[PDB]
Design a binder for this molecule. Structure first.
Ligand SMILES: *[C@@H]1O[C@H](CO)[C@@H](O[C@@H]2O[C@H](CO)[C@@H](O[C@@H]3O[C@H](CO)[C@@H](O)[C@H](O)[C@@H]3O)[C@H](O)[C@H]2NC(C)=O)[C@H](O)[C@H]1NC(C)=O
Ligand SMILES: *[C@@H]1O[C@H](CO)[C@@H](O)[C@H](O)[C@H]1NC(C)=O
Ligand SMILES: *[C@@H]1O[C@H](CO)[C@@H](O)[C@H](O)[C@H]1NC(C)=O
Ligand SMILES: *[C@@H]1O[C@H](CO)[C@@H](O)[C@H](O)[C@H]1NC(C)=O
Ligand SMILES: *[C@@H]1O[C@H](CO)[C@@H](O)[C@H](O)[C@H]1NC(C)=O
Ligand SMILES: *[C@@H]1O[C@H](CO)[C@@H](O)[C@H](O)[C@H]1NC(C)=O
Ligand SMILES: *[C@@H]1O[C@H](CO)[C@@H](O)[C@H](O)[C@H]1NC(C)=O
Lengths: 342, 421, 385
């Protein structure tokens, strides 16, 4: 039976770097406010030119190129994201209530203590429902129901600009972020997500055969092979790793404090992915048996105007500041998954 | 014998042609120099139904084309058929025995038939659509194409993969039910671009402006961008294939190309390229490929030209004919309603158009989130307002903006193919 | 054996569409039956966030963590539900007593306490001609009250469509009155919709989609049929002609109908009453306090057995040998637009006639379009050599 991961879209400001992120917020205001009406490199700066963008150069200056966009909404987003990545690699040594207000299954209660929790820099805090139980029947009373807080005010205003929970449905023993079947839920609604699984058999046989070595514990899958291959190219060309990917045992995450031209390196390799120059796609096969999840979703307003007096008390019971909530019903659509072959 | 082969997975290929239309056919601030008199009459019809006691010197030559009549049959031995104008309180009846209808006519109005509704909302909507069609069909298209939403206004930002994009990169067409429609990656005038990676990072990213404050109030009942995916060089039948995208919302559409290829006549009746079918296609001057809906919509126009001596507004027109309108063809409303409601016509055309051997389809997965979030609105809309590259209308409407992401899904390719045993 | 796939561009049969309001019963009515219970929910909530029903299922305190008992005559062993969210305890406990009250009310009065077709449907349209309450059959669902099914009445011909798109499918405007939702039952607002064969029972609660108000919800369809071979080649059944279980649903056989009817039969077999929220076997009565004071425990244990296949049902019920399914492609758009709202709402509140003199709110309406996206019908078929 497949799992589901919920991510809040609101990453933290880790205490070890709290001052540096304030420096970046100040710098970002100084820039946007110019284009329109302390280790961080203040010269990797936004420019109005493509119509707006930012330049990247070689370690001695010399060669340079611009990433440029039709609109500032894209340029500011990506530029701030680059500087955010440039900070988080500095500190710490990878060190570290919930947004799940309530959970239930078939009348039973459940809590965050029963989920598995982790973070990812661009998706925020994440929880895995990790159900070891077997689906009894179709219908909502036989799948989980979850009530979730969407943190509309304290979003980091430049890093990500969506209001809603991200849903990722995936198999057992998978990291959720690669090959993400990312569905999303608006605040103030109840989303009824029904899951159907398709499988295909024919390639790398569950990890047996040819591979490029992986950098995290998982079932083998093509996307993970591409990610580790990209990280290998990054590390072997520029002796540091990119932050949104796992880190080889002998590497360091890139930052201007030690790798003063890493942006040029990264975005040229990423352009090789944009134009599909990289060798990884030829190195990495599909699994010899594989499955994909297909979601059919209905949505409705929640809570009703008359029963809204309840969610106010559910927030008060948790003492939370404060429609702001969302609800997700997750249904396993049919006991009818079967393989496609020949 | 025929063997069914199949395959599924991911493959680099030409990204689907995407087409973008605003739900309103025209900008009310520009088209209202024609629709002034019809709107001045429509408001009076509404006042005659909703609050009669408030009920000047209207244009009844618009009304006498196809007047609405009240019909009430709650006195079975003697029904009363009653025109709303030219007439114990003053109320129109809405009871279970009351109906509302359009009195379509022909032959110096010596023969007539009623198109019949149970609800004033449908009656008024259909009456206004027919009257506005009569109005529009008299305007030359070279001018009518300039009273709808320019791409310069509507496509507010665009980005494919990481390559720049803007309005002049779309091929424009006038689709008479929707006004100007803009087609991306159509693959006709230039080579089409491929997409080699799955996920939104490598799809099409759009910000669009629905000018809701400027919709035609009696035509544009729905607010959104009408949206469709289709293969290169084919015509977008956006009326029945089209998705909607909602404003104030980031819509993400994951695409799976799901083809089915058949053999042809010695194993199945399909046609490979349409050179063989009995009926010529009036979409020839778009230079698009053959498709059965193009063939059906050319049956209908051919039979309209055959019966009424004019062609209807919603379809192309062979170079010799005229569009139906009340000045030249007084009987066109009745003559068109017959063909529209005749199921026998649909049957005899489906018996005349052979369907294509390549059944190609896009199995979209649609996802939505509120955009922009509360914390970012105040800078996103300032940025977008400050770079419209036009010197007018500074006030970018905050409740009219859409954002689209269209991308190839994790599995983007599925194909079924017939093969000879 | 072999498989082959055929495509017909042809005039199609239209499905049966079942529409429900998400609110079971118009609250201004059922108040006169539930006030006896809402006194006790109010007392409980005022105790946590400042007694006949509290005596039947006591609320318990577990050092705050709270829940309730589900216990039986040999009270040594019995079940309990306990909740980390104290207020969620009251929400679930109220749903418990609400269902045990409603399961006692006779069917013909209970129907009258819910929405009528003339009240739920503002306007209706199909292939260019109007429809009304006379074109929908009633369907009483024990949770959702009254649901109305299009294109399903007997001894008159099944509706069939010959043109593609929303202009020639079904489209309706639904009135979804947010003022009449039960205040004590936390729920969403909208309408449920499920698209099914005429001979198929609508498990609308389990399988149905949902509609959001102030939207035009368009549901374009393609029809996929598939057929496969019987027991000499693969295990399946033809309309229930060879299984030892009875379809109490009065509908054509399917795996779900077999599962649920087998469970209802076992349910009636032990402790003598039928589970509510499902149809009633021909010799049974719905479970309730007044007749079956321990019933929820003999349901709990039997349910725990079912999910582990220990009742045998899930081993002996079989898959149906052929089926249709409509691959829906749902979408939403804001309706009415800001400018059209001026005239459209007055006209709709006139089309409702007698029912309300005050204007409709944009949030009390929903519009629905159901149509064949194209006349192409996909048929997948298997046969032996
Ligand atoms: C009701 O309104 C209709 C139109 O909605 C009025 O008809 C219009 O009458 C004017 C004046 O006769 C016509 O203008 C003509 O324009 C042509 C060039 O387009 C010009 O060559 C002529 O000298 C003249 O200016 C206009 O074509 C005509 N429109 C139509 C559709 O026939 C009518 O006057 C109004 N009737 C009543 C009863 O109020
Ligand atoms: C997942 O499967 C891999 C093999 O693909 C196995 O080595 C590993 O122990 C499993 N669990 C995790 C957490 O990776
Ligand atoms: C179908 O595709 C095949 C192979 O590309 C080609 O031979 C045939 O002309 C195509 N027909 C249409 C209608 O695209
Ligand atoms: C269409 O194909 C037919 C044979 O199938 C051929 O005779 C004809 O020349 C082709 N026409 C075009 C326009 O490709
Ligand atoms: C079709 O091609 C003809 C001849 O090249 C040209 O006159 C016409 O404008 C073209 N139309 C389109 C839509 O490309
Ligand atoms: C229920 O019946 C009562 C009278 O017995 C009537 O006042 C009420 O309108 C009825 N409601 C419905 C929905 O039939
Ligand atoms: C159901 O109640 C009725 C009336 O008392 C009667 O048929 C019988 O007593 C009951 N049957 C069962 C199975 O409980």
């Amino acid at each position: 039976l497949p799992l589901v991961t919920l991510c809040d879209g609101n990453p933290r400001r880790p205490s070890p770097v709290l001052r540096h992120l304030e420096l970046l917020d100040e710098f970002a205001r100084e820039n946007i406010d110019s284009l329109y009406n302390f280790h961080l490199d203040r010269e990797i700066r936004l420019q109005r030119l493509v119509r707006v963008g930012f330049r990247l150069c070689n370690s001695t200056g010399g060669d340079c190129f611009y990433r440029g966009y039709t609109s500032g909404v894209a340029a500011v987003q990506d530029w701030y994201h680059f500087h955010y990545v440039d900070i988080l690699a500095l500190l710490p040594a990878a060190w570290e209530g919930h947004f799940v207000l309530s959970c239930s299954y078939d009348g039973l209660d459940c809590q965050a203590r029963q989920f598995r929790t982790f973070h990812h820099p661009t998706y925020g805090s994440c929880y895995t429902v990790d159900g070891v139980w077997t689906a009894q029947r179709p219908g909502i009373t036989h799948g989980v129901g979850l009530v979730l807080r969407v943190e509309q005010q304290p979003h980091l205003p430049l890093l990500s600009t969506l209001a809603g929970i991200r849903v990722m449905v995936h198999g057992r023993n998978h990291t959720p972020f690669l090959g993400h079947h990312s569905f999303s839920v608006r605040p103030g609604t109840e989303a009824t997500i029904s899951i159907r699984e398709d499988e295909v058999h024919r390639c790398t046989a569950g990890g047996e055969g040819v591979e490029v070595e992986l950098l995290h514990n998982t079932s083998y899958t093509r996307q993970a092979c591409l990610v580790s291959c990209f990280q290998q190219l990054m590390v072997e060309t520029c002796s540091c790793g990119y932050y949104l990917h796992p880190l080889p045992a002998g590497a360091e995450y890139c930052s201007s404090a030690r790798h003063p031209a890493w942006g040029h390196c990264f975005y040229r390799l990423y352009q090789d992915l944009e134009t599909h120059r990289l060798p990884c796609t030829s190195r990495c096969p599909r699994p010899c048996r594989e499955s994909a999840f297909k979601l059919s979703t209905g949505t409705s307003r929640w809570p009703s105007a008359k029963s809204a007096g309840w969610t106010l008390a559910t927030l008060g019971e948790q003492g939370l500041p404060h429609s702001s909530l969302a609800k997700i019903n997750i249904v396993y659509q049919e006991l009818n998954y079967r393989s496609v072959e020949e | 014998e025929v063997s069914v082969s199949l395959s599924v997975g991911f493959k680099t290929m030409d990204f689907p042609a995407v087409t973008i239309c605003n739900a309103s056919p025209f900008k009310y601030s520009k088209i209202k120099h024609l629709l002034k008199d019809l709107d001045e009459l429509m408001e009076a019809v509404l006042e005659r139904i909703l609050a009669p006691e408030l009920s000047r010197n209207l244009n009844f030559s618009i009304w006498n084309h196809t007047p609405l009549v009240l019909i009430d049959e709650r006195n079975p031995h003697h029904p009363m058929v009653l025109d709303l104008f030219g007439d114990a309180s003053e109320k129109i009846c809405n009871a279970h025995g009351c109906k509302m209808a359009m009195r379509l006519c022909s032959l110096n109005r010596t023969q007539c038939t009623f198109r019949n509704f149970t609800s004033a909302t449908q009656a008024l909507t259909e009456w206004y659509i027919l009257q506005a069609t009569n109005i529009f069909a008299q305007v030359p298209q070279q001018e009518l194409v300039e009273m709808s939403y320019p791409g310069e206004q509507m496509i507010l930002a665009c980005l494919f993969g990481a390559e720049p994009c803007n309005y002049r990169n779309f091929t424009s067409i006038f689709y008479p039910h929707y006004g100007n429609c803009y087609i991306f990656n159509w693959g006709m005038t230039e080579k089409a671009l491929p997409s080699a990676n799955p996920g939104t990072e490598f799809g099409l990213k759009l910000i669009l402006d629905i000018g809701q404050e400027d919709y035609v109030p009696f035509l544009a009942s729905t607010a959104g961008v009408r949206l469709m995916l289709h293969e290169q060089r084919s015509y977008p039948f956006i009326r029945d294939e089209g998705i909607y995208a909602m404003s104030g919302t980031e819509t993400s559409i994951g695409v799976l190309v799901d083809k089915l290829q058949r053999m042809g006549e010695p194993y199945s009746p399909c046609t490979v390229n349409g050179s063989e079918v009995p009926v010529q296609n009036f979409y020839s001057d778009y230079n698009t490929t053959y498709s059965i809906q193009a063939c059906l919509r050319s049956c209908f126009q051919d039979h309209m030209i055959r019966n009424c001596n004019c062609g209807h507004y919603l379809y192309p027109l062979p170079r010799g004919e005229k569009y139906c309108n009340n000045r030249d063809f007084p009987d066109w409303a009745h003559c068109y309603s017959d063909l529209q409601m005749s199921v026998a016509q649909r049957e005899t055309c489906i018996g005349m158009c052979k369907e294509s051997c390549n059944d190609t389809q896009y199995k979209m997965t649609i996802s939505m989130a509120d955009w922009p979030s509360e914390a970012s609105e105040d800078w996103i809309f300032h940025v977008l307002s400050q770079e419209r590259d036009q010197s007018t209308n500074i006030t970018l409407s905050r409740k009219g903006i859409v954002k689209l992401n269209i991308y190839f899904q994790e599995f983007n390719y599925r194909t079924i193919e017939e093969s000879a045993a | 054996v072999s498989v082959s796939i055929k495509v017909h561009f042809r005039k199609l049969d239209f499905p049966a569409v079942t529409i429900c309001n998400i609110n079971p019963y118009k609250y201004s009515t059922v108040r006169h039956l539930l006030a006896d219970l809402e006194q006790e929910t109010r007392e409980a909530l005022k105790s946590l966030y400042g007694p006949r029903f509290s005596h039947r299922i006591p609320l318990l305190i577990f050092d705050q963590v709270v829940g309730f008992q589900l216990c039986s005559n040999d009270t040594s062993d019995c079940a309990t539900y306990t909740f980390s969210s104290g207020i969620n305890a009251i929400q679930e406990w109220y749903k418990l007593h609400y269902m045990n009250i409603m399961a006692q009310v006779p069917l013909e009065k209970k129907i009258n306490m819910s929405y009528s077709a003339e009240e739920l449907l503002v306007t209706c349209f199909f292939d260019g001609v109007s429809c009304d309450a006379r074109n929908f059959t009633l369907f009483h669902h024990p949770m959702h009250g009254n649901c109305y099914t299009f294109n399903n009445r007997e001894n008159e011909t099944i509706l069939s469509t010959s043109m593609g798109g929303s202009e020639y499918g079904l489209q309706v405007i639904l009135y979804i009155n947010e003022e009449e939702y039960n205040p004590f039952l936390v729920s969403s607002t909208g309408a449920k919709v499920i698209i099914h064969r005429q001979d198929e029972y609508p498990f609308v609660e389990d399988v149905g989609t949902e509609i959001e108000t102030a939207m035009v919800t368009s549901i374009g369809m393609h029809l996929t049929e598939s057929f496969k071979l019987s027991e000499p080649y693969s295990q399946c059944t033809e309309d229930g002609s060879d299984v030892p279980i009875r379809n109490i649903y009065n509908a054509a056989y399917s795996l779900q109908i077999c599962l649920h009817s087998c469970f209802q039969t076992k349910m009636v077999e032990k402790c003598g009453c039928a589970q509510y929220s499902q149809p009633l076997p021909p010799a049974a009565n719905y479970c309730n306090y007044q007749q079956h004071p321990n019933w929820m425990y003999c349901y709990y244990q039997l349910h725990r057995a079912f999910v582990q296949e220990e009742l045998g049902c899930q081993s002996v019920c079989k898959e149906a040998c052929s089926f249709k399914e409509w691959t829906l492609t749902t979408s939403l758009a804001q309706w009415p637009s800001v400018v059209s709202e001026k005239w459209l709402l007055p006209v709709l509140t006139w089309d409702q006639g007698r029912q309300v003199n005050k204007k409709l709110n944009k949030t009390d309406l929903a519009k629905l379009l159901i149509f064949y996206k194209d006349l192409n019908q996909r048929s997948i078929m298997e046969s032996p050599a």
